[PDB]
Amino acid sequence: SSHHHHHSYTVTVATGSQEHAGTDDYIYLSLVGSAGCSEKHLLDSFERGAVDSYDVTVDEELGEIQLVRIEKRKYGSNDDWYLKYITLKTPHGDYIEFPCYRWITGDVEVVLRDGRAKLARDDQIHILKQHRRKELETRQKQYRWMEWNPGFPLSIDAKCHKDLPRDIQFDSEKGVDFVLNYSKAMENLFINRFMHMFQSSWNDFADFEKIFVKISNTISERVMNHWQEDLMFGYQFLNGANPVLIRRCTELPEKLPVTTEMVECSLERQLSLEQEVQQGNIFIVDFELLDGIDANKTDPCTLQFLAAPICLLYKNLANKIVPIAIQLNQIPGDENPIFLPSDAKYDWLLAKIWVRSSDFHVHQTITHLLRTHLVSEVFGIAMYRQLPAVHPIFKLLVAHVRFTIAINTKAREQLICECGLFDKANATGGGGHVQMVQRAMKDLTYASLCFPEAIKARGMESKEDIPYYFYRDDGLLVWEAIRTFTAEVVDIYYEGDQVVEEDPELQDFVNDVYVYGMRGRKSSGFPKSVKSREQLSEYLTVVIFTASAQHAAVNFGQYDWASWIPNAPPTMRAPPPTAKGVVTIEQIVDTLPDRGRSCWHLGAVWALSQFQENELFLGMYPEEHFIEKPVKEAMARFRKNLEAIVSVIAERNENLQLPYYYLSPDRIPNSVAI
Ligand SMILES: [Fe+2]
């Protein structure tokens, strides 16, 4: 597809591969040399995926080339042009590359530095210092902060996807489109007939299983057959879709008045409950955050209900963690019983179903939305505002914030907006899901996002004591691989800690995240400034890990584990049981979501779990912002490292009844894009 035009600099221009990447409009190129600029030469039709070469000879001698300038002048229609990169081969024999990876509308001229990475401190001539300063001044008018809802992290200043800068939109306007992807998911799953039966209950578990067997995958079929098993219930806290809430229990809360006699049948070591606690064998999962959140009222006909359960869990003689007591609300009472696996069959099944519906809410809104998407958009915005394209940290982070602002904005326009599709199936729809974010912000700390540290704060770090925590195990290896990569990057570009402390754009980028993203909350623990290479290396690992590995661990298991509804009910249509011996299976069915919500849930988890045809997986950096040998060798090592992790995860999972593969580096996107 390479087209050479001969008629001197050799100027090659690479157009992009995406749908509308090509243009028919006139293209003018200029060279800014150390010794004076050049004319506005007309290269002249750049089709998608092209590589066009033009011979260009200048009316004067320019010296070393500092900048390349691009201008697009309409021809007929307004045709946007995606520009990958420009190269020159000079009369002296020098090859210089200028990375772009931006959308050129006719609105603004584009000016690109040669792709070596440069700190402000490197630029001492006016030609470069003015470009750098004018680039940031332009970023900061283009990428602005805005509060979408009160108390939230701040987000991009755009009502809808259309108003975003083209540079950060999706390559097609509705290529990723929640409202179409959800309904299209519901044809493929073939539950178009139940889409609008928001009043019809599944006749019994069989009637829903008819629908599900058609559409089951490996894990979701295993969940269909084993979801009533306590072993599976417990298993998900460590290795399902939301494996971050459990923690080792060091003293039993006063709010859980559970005694040894109540759970002697579960205990297996000839020890009392208190002794089991002192020994590290008791674990807890406490949904107090759900205490007081409003239940969804958007539908007058159907009543939605929420709980705030306490779930006590026991590591048995086989080192599996099983549930041994469940209180469905926070304030103990006689109408808030402690349900036990010794209870009537449906009392304890129903109790376990409420804990699963609770895990789901906390997962979707907090773990998923707040703590991977919103957090990531924050980093993305601060990055575009404060880090010019030539800065090493922009070259590094930009891959990892690709379509992050675009997806989050399509969601605020459509999914979690007022009267959005989130309200169709979830009991935190209506507004409850905004309160959850507000009250969760108090816990959104920098330390919580340091994966090892965060695992230890939950007392879950010991592999000897807790040996089936595959989420932890894989996370730790991917965290360290990123840790090794970012540290190689900072060490390449920052020879000492003083260089890190004295980098104004790096400090502003970090200060932007703390003041605007996190609202300047002292309790957030975010750095106001980074003053060492170690601290920056860790900071960078936080950004990348949150955006790839954490987002992929909590996002791509959604269909595996929530497509069998009774294992992850988005909503509940009856309040929790206040007493034992009352609940019947017929009453559990009528509590579970109707056919209608059930289907909107199924498309949702289906769509959200898909990979794009040409997804970019961790360490795949087709856009060469970096072009220098040492950082490209760091990246190669990063690729070799991630693959070694893929080999050990695959070896592990061949031995497992239910493989954990969400954090296998070959399935972890670079960024939050769905
Ligand atoms: Fe996501």
176 C-alpha to ligand 1 centroid (Å): 12
Give the distance (Å) from ligand 1 centre to CA of residue 547.
9
Residue 460 CB partners (closer than 8 Å, separation 6+): 246, 247, 248, 466, 469, 472
The number of beta carbons lying within 10 Å of the beta carbon of residue 404 is 27
With vertex at residue 602, the alpha carbon angle to CA 599 and CA 605, rounded to the nearest 5 degrees, is 150
Walk me through the domains of the chain, giving residue ranges and CATH numbers.
1-115 (2.60.60.20), 116-243+360-671 (1.20.245.10), 244-359 (3.10.450.60)
Distance (Å) from CA 372 to ligand 1 centroid: 7
Residue count of the chain, please give it.
Answer: 674
Instruction: Identify the CA nearest to 114 among candidates 96, 129, 126.
Output: 96
The continuous run of DSSP H or E covering 335 comes out as none
Sorted by sequence, the CB contacts under 8 Å of residue 304 that are 6+ apart come out as 295, 296, 297, 427, 429, 430, 571, 572, 573
Ligand 1 center to 246 CA (angstroms): 21
CA distance 628 to 528: 31
Any idea which residue has 């590591």 for tokens? 315
For residue 517, the CA-to-ligand 1 centroid distance in Å is 19
In angstroms, rounded to a whole number, what is the distance separating the alpha carbons of residues 607 and 383? 29
Q: How remote is the CA of residue 309 from the centroid of ligand 1, in Å?
A: 26
Terminal-to-terminal C-alpha distance of the chain = 32
Given a contact cutoff of 8 angstroms between Cβ atoms, the answer to whether 378 and 153 are in contact is yes
Please give the Cα distance from 400 to 20 (Å, whole number). Answer: 23
Instruction: Give the residue among 153, 91, 230, 54 at the shortest CA–CA distance from 405.
Output: 153
- CA 277 from chain centre, in angstroms, equals 35
CA of 170 to the centre of ligand 1 (A): 15
Instruction: Report d(CA 168, CA 613) in Å as an integer.
Output: 20
Sequence-ordered list of residues with C-beta below 8 angstroms from that of 351, at least 6 positions apart, any chain: 309, 326, 328, 339, 343, 577
**344 and 332 Cβ atoms separated by less than 8 Å:** no
From ligand 1's centre to the CA of 430, what distance in Å?
Answer: 21
Residue partners of 231: CB distance under 8 A and separation at least 6: 320, 322
DSSP H/E element including 250: none
Q: How many CA atoms lie within 13 A of 524 on its CB side?
A: 18
Separation of 407 CA from ligand 1 center, angstroms? Answer: 8
Q: State the alpha helices, DSSP H only, in 310-388.
A: 345-362, 375-386
Q: Compute the distance from residue 551 Cα to the ligand 1 centre, in Å.
A: 6
- How far does residue 61's CA lie from ligand 1's centre (Å)? 52
* HEC-encoded secondary structure of 181-209: HHHHHHHHCCCCCCCCCCCCCCCCHHHHH
Q: How many Å lie between the centroid of ligand 1 and the Cα of residue 608?
A: 7
Contact 29, 68 (CB under 8 A): yes
The DSSP element (H or E) to which 88 belongs, if any, is: strand 81-89
Bridge partner list, 53: 4, 12
What sign does the CA torsion over 56, 62, 66, 67 have?
A: negative
Of 28, 40, 42, 38, residue with least CA distance to 60: 38
Cα of 237 to ligand 1 centre, how many Å? 19
| CA 103, 104, 110, 116 torsion-angle sign | positive
In 3D space, the residue among 544, 547, 570 whose CA is nearest the CA of residue 558 turns out to be: 570
Phi-psi region of 195 (alpha: psi -120 to 50; beta: other; left: phi over 0): alpha
Residue 663: C-alpha distances to residues 242, 304, 474 (Å): 13, 34, 6
Taking the centre of ligand 1 as the mean of its atom positions, its distance from the CA of residue 320, in whole angstroms, is 29
With contact defined as beta carbons under 8 Å apart, do 162 and 177 qualify?
no
Distance (Å, whole) CA 540 – CA 634? 15
- What is the 234 CA–ligand 1 centroid distance (Å)? 24
Determine the distance separating the centroid of ligand 1 and the alpha carbon of 461, expressed in angstroms.
Answer: 26
* CA quadruple 520, 526, 531, 533: dihedral sign: negative
